[PDB]
Amino acid sequence: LGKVSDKSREISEKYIEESQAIIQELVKLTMEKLESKFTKLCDLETQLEM
Amino acid sequence: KYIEESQAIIQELVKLTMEKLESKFTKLCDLETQLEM
Amino acid sequence: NNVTLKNLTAFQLLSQRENICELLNLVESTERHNSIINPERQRMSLEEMKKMLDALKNER
């Protein structure tokens, strides 16, 4: 069972690398979303001043 | 290395974005108070 | 788009079998693992992050 445990440990490391990559791409997408909503905020500010 | 550089860049980018948005919020709150007056 | 008992059991059994076959190293999933990572997409996203960071740096 020890060899099984060690192999599964290495596989788990592989999968945490994969998850790190996915999380980075998620961060990028949320950044784009926030930029769009920031432009929306600017328009709203113009309306308030009017 | 690759992902490490990406991590540093992401940390800095998130920090700057949070600061920018908080400043925008402060400005909007002041303008809203003036509008209410 | 529909979920029945047969579909659910087949899905769970497929996941289990894939995991076990991966434990014994009886499977080569380079295509899936490099379509999910997608190193080209990694480079694209990294350059986009760099450009956005430069933009935020220069606005001050």
How does this model look, in words?
The PDB classes it as gene regulation. The structure is cut from a larger assembly and holds 2 copies of chain A and 1 copy of chain C (60 residues). With 50 residues, chain A is mainly α. Chain A is built from 1 helix and no strands. Chain C is mostly helical. Chain C has one domain. Chains in contact: A-B, A-C, B-C. The interface between A and B is medium-sized, with 13 and 14 residues.
Helix content of chain C: over 70%
**Major sheet description of chain A:** none
The general outline of chain A is: rod-shaped
Number of domains of chain C: 1
Question: In sequence order, what are the helices and strands of chain A, one letter per element?
Answer: H
Distance between the termini of chain A: 73 Å
Count of DSSP H/I helices of chain C: 3
Give the beta-strand count of chain C: 0
Organism (chain A): Saccharomyces cerevisiae (strain ATCC 204508 / S288c)
Protein name (chain A): Chromatin structure-remodeling complex protein RSC8
Subcellular location (chain A): Nucleus
Keywords (chain C): Acetylation, Cell cycle, Nucleus, Transcription, Transcription regulation
Primary descriptors:
3 chains, A: 50 residues, 96% helix, rod-shaped, C: 3 helices, Chromatin structure-remodeling complex protein RSC8 (chain A), High temperature lethal protein 1 (chain C)
Topology at a glance:
The structure is cut from a larger assembly and holds two copies of chain A and one copy of chain C (60 residues).
Chain A (H helix, E strand, L loop, with lengths): L1 H48 L1
Chain C lengths: L4 H19 L6 H8 L1 H20 L2
Keywords (chain C): Acetylation, Cell cycle, Nucleus, Transcription, Transcription regulation
Organism (chain C): Saccharomyces cerevisiae (strain ATCC 204508 / S288c) (Baker's yeast)
Protein name (chain C): High temperature lethal protein 1
